[PDB]
Design a protein around this ligand. Structure first.
Ligand SMILES: [Ca+2]
Ligand SMILES: [Ca+2]
Ligand SMILES: [Ca+2]
Ligand SMILES: [Ca+2]
Ligand SMILES: [Ca+2]
Ligand SMILES: [Ca+2]
Ligand SMILES: [Ca+2]
Ligand SMILES: [Ca+2]
Ligand SMILES: [Ca+2]
Ligand SMILES: [Ca+2]
Ligand SMILES: [Ca+2]
Ligand SMILES: [Ca+2]
Ligand SMILES: [Ca+2]
Ligand SMILES: [Ca+2]
Ligand SMILES: [Ca+2]
Ligand SMILES: [Ca+2]
Ligand SMILES: [Ca+2]
Ligand SMILES: [Ca+2]
Ligand SMILES: [Ca+2]
Ligand SMILES: [Ca+2]
Ligand SMILES: [Ca+2]
Ligand SMILES: [Ca+2]
Ligand SMILES: [Ca+2]
Ligand SMILES: [Ca+2]
Ligand SMILES: [Ca+2]
Ligand SMILES: [Ca+2]
Ligand SMILES: [Ca+2]
Ligand SMILES: [Ca+2]
Lengths: 93, 93, 93, 93, 93, 94, 93, 93, 93, 93, 94, 93, 93, 93
């Protein structure tokens, strides 16, 4: 296990496609152990969701394009993890 | 485990059927490891519950329809997990 | 394991009988592994309690009848876990 | 693993006997695997402490009496677990 | 195990001896597994510390002899555990 | 066995570019770095504050400080360090 | 393991030497399994770190003479743990 | 003023009468300035409300007559103020 | 001022009419000093608002027949205030 | 405006007499501008409530006695304000 | 006396441009707007979420919704509205 | 107003004399408007209290001597307000 | 009073000039009732501060340039207020 | 009021002089409405206090020097207010 192993991003999203679509679909890409989508805010034209993605050697620009193939839009990359083992954020002042 | 593996959704519901009822019935569905339902807020007409359903390649359309047919009505999908392993949501400012 | 594996309900009850009785009893019902009763509040005349019951294929009606025959009533069913495996509640916005 | 396997009682005792006396004593009671006594609050005349007790088919009446024998006095019973397993309490709104 | 397995007490104490000593010292007492000492509040004359001390069957009075012996003063015993198994306080209203 | 620096957590200022999964891939492959983690602190218009949690074996704070800067980064403060045989977590207190 | 296995102290210090130094150099110390230094508060003059050090039969005096050598100043010993076992502080009212 | 100027009580109560009535009604009682009623928890059979009622010299029993009179049931009086001036509870350990 | 001076209810509602409508139209209502509508939760179907309405001798039935006219549905009456004076809820254990 | 102008005492009383009795009674005591009694906690045998009292050169011994006369019992004194002004307590680490 | 809409709180998506004190000045001078307040929610790379609290007399939600959009804004949701004679604040509850 | 207008200090003290005495007394000192004593904690042997004193040009030494002559010692001076006008503490990161 | 009345921005800042400089200086500009600078984070080359500025018809690009005239740098405009009267943010979900 | 009107700073200090001392002395300085000092953390050598000083056109250099000369040492300036009116900090994510 190497490279990007965990990606977390917040996207904006026309209400369609429905979000179990996105999950099902993001499963397929290059070595994805699994995806987590949680609903952030739920506005009227639109939808804020937090996508958590994790696997081996992940393809960033693949995800990033795969997502837009769905009329969905990355607002920001919240967190990235890379390397042999899965490091979490440590808190502090 | 593949495709959809855990689904979290909040549904509005008439007081009947009761909630254990739903729970029992949802244990049935195609590849359903198990179901949790906690009681959100219990207005006079009606009853908001939370639905936590996990399993292997769960069928979304199966579920929604199982709930409607039941009296329930789906307000949102709060969260989904799709893939080989359970990715929990990683939290961040 | 199948069906009703966890049941949590809040019931009003008179000071009688002493709570260890209801526990000591509801232990004995069909398919109950354990029972937990925590004290909620205690008013002059009466008494609120939460009642967690876990087991295999607990029959929802035995249980409730049991509590009634002891002189307390089910104000509400707060949570229910059903299926093969203990699904816990996933928290979300 | 049957009957009362955990009893938390809140009780008022005169200062004396000191708090690890009870601990000592109550441990030597039938079925009793263990005893925790934390100090709740302490007033001029008197001392409010909580008595968590764990074991196996515990005697509610021995205990009740045992505590009273040392000049203690049961203000209330705040928890009970009964059965083959320790069911902790599930929380909900 | 047997007797007291845990005793927690809050004590007042001059600045000296510095508290790593109290730790060391009490560690060497009869039947002591380990001893934790966190610093509560640091006053100008004195010092206020929590001593958690645990192990197999503890001599409460030895423990009280030893502390006083370094210029301690036992304000209160906050918690005591005894018996065969390490029961913790359970949370409750 | 591990020795030396084993985890480091630094806060840095960062030109929007390069994007952040750059850093993560990049840093990932340093000397004896089992894993890096970057969470995003604050995404200002001019710049962008981000937090790097780096972890490995006998780690070279100077290979790291230099690599970041190359990418145009800037260490503001180092917030945590764990050195030695075992991973020790911070304990809390009054 | 015996005597002190964990020591937590709050210290003040010049900006140099930078903190990953202080970390390196106490791994060096006698019987020190590892050290954790989180940054408490960074001022203009100076710089407040917390130092959590863990090992076997640690030497308080080596540790402390060493910190003064590095220019630092030990404000307080916030917690100490001693004996065979990592007793954590049990929290109470 | 004189006598009771404030009484707060928690009551259980069937769904009907809807609670704007209780408010209205109690407003018209002897010496009543105003009356606040917030909704605690909404159970299936019943309903749990807090009634804050205030004014000049209140007839406690009239207040208890009037509530019962609509199918109320007084679980407890939570707070009472009397005298010339409106003293509130002061916070303290 | 007399009878109800403040009423707070939680309601569910279609997205239309948009919420500044609902606001306008209850200012219209009889004896209504003003209304506050904050948005509780926005779903795909529907839309949960809280409605805080304040005035003199307000008419619960006008208010409520009016909300149903606008397509809405009143889930619960969360708080009511009645009499000459805006008694707020005094909070207690 | 001299001497004791506020006394908060925490006290255990048998259920009877009910709580607005004391309120009534204590108000008719010398110097006494007002009396708040909130309910602290309530057990099977007994009832713990807090008595905040406000006035002017208050008699500690009248009160102490007065409370005792009704079968009440002072567990402790939690606040005192004395002088020409009500000084509330300032908080600090 | 005031009538009609008197306070409105809306959340909008916003191209980084125009900058935010634009909006504030601009909106300030609408029909019967005693004051506007904009706090910044989240400053993403592509866009930017911001919150407008607008307040005045018999306010025209449609003059407002239109003005925002002109500046390239986009209402996502209206979060609060106060209409009528007096300013009523939300009361809280279980 | 000039000089020492507010003084807050935490002092240890024996159960004697009863706290209203220390208030009743410290009221009488030179330049004291009001005095507030809240109960901090109460141990078997002794007693912690916070002591807010407000006045004009309070002499710091009279006050302290006063408390000593009553048999409690000043553990620390938590806060002091000096000058013409009551400056309150401004909170900051 | 019209236009911008309140501006709040977070800037980055070489440690010089000192921050009482910035305050003193920002006072002068076109109609500034007053400025508030609080210290955010305090890094080693650098300094995060939150500037709050308030007056009549404020000159944005004046401030914005005035600030940089000091080797200081706007990272983001956090909040702006405009018009006849001073509107604060209202909170909500 | 003009120029500097309120200054908030945290300073490290030897135990002597005491803190009221400082307070008194700082009431003196050029145009000083009044001073607050609360006690932050009281390490063994030393004493972190917070300094809140407000007034009219306060002279910064005067102050720092008044504190140093006193034994104290300035770690940071946490906050300042300069202008015609006291702008408090307005808080935001
Ligand atoms: Ca974002
Ligand atoms: Ca930490
Ligand atoms: Ca409701
Ligand atoms: Ca929802
Ligand atoms: Ca994180
Ligand atoms: Ca009650
Ligand atoms: Ca979550
Ligand atoms: Ca007490
Ligand atoms: Ca739960
Ligand atoms: Ca102290
Ligand atoms: Ca519990
Ligand atoms: Ca930093
Ligand atoms: Ca701890
Ligand atoms: Ca505990
Ligand atoms: Ca319920
Ligand atoms: Ca208090
Ligand atoms: Ca209260
Ligand atoms: Ca109790
Ligand atoms: Ca304070
Ligand atoms: Ca929204
Ligand atoms: Ca309320
Ligand atoms: Ca104590
Ligand atoms: Ca502040
Ligand atoms: Ca920013
Ligand atoms: Ca609100
Ligand atoms: Ca310290
Ligand atoms: Ca500082
Ligand atoms: Ca704000």
């Amino acid at each position: 296990a190497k490279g990007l192993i965990r990606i977390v991003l917040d996207i904006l999203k026309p209400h369609e496609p429905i979000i179990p679509e996105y999950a099902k679909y993001l499963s397929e890409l290059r070595g994805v152990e699994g995806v987590n989508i949680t609903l952030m805010e739920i506005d009227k034209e639109t939808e804020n969701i937090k996508v958590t993605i994790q696997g081996n050697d992940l393809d960033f620009d693949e995800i990033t394009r795969a997502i837009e193939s769905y009329g969905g839009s990355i607002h920001s990359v919240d967190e990235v993890v890379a390397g042999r083992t899965m490091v979490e954020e440590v808190t502090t002042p």
